């Protein structure tokens, strides 16, 4: 009288804890997927729409006038403020290439920081993906071992005596892989979507650097 539920009902307390642990790891990997997938979709959709607007700009003044309505948590507004703030910290400087260096360096820090901050939670996906096969396998090795330790006492010569315990054991590898495969797919999906998002944010940051660079050189010629 076996079924996928009846096997969990008639299992060892260590195999139950492995199976419950892997089901909780499955709940976590899918909760992280639905949470981060919506967040990445919204931020990608916003950043692409902001980039389409800022592509019209021909000065850093025109760009931060275009961005002035963007939400207080807009990434392109945050980059434009960080360029404008290097100018307002530098007002005594006759050296323009020093401002170009300092802003270039500071925006590189922030584009990297946004990509790093966006990568929160991926350590769970990587860990669940790496260990779930080994946690399910430990359930199998333990379940098989506890069965043969028994026969070693009973002296029974028939495979049908251990077969329920063997099936209950292999099931913990099956659940182990069901926890593992989604987590390793989803980890690679987000690692790739962070790469593409960081690249798009770099294309936005580059426009801020180009506008600031252009304006400083045009202003220097106009003063001369």
């Amino acid at each position: 009288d076996l079924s996928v539920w009846g096997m969990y009902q008639h299992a060892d307390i260590v195999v139950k804890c492995v199976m419950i642990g892997l089901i909780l790891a499955s709940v976590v990997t899918w909760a992280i997927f639905f949470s981060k997938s919506v967040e990445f979709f919204n931020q990608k959709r916003r950043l692409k729409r902001e980039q389409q607007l800022l592509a019209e700009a021909r000065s850093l003044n025109q760009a931060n006038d275009i961005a002035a309505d963007f939400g207080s948590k807009s990434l392109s507004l945050h980059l434009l403020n960080e360029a404008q703030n290097e100018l307002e910290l530098s007002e005594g400087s006759d050296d323009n290439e020093g401002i170009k260096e300092r802003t270039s360096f500071r925006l590189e820090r922030r584009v990297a920081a946004v990509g790093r901050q966006m990568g929160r939670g991926n350590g769970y996906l990587a860990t669940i993906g790496a260990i779930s096969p080994f946690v399910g396998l430990f359930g199998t090795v333990w379940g098989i071992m506890n069965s043969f330790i028994g026969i070693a006492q009973t002296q029974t010569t028939n495979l049908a005596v251990v077969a329920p315990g063997i099936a209950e054991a292999l099931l913990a590898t099956a659940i182990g892989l069901v926890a593992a495969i989604p987590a390793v797919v989803i980890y690679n999906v987000f690692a790739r979507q962070i790469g593409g998002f960081k690249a798009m944010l770099g294309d936005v940051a580059a426009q801020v650097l180009l506008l600031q660079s252009r304006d400083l050189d045009l202003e220097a010629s106009a003063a001369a």
Partner: peptide, 23 residues
Amino acid sequence: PWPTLLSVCIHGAVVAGLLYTSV
């Protein structure tokens, strides 16, 4: 929050199927 509730509900739904199909 909404992502943990959705995830635990869809896994609740499949294990309710194991309870049903095992009678």
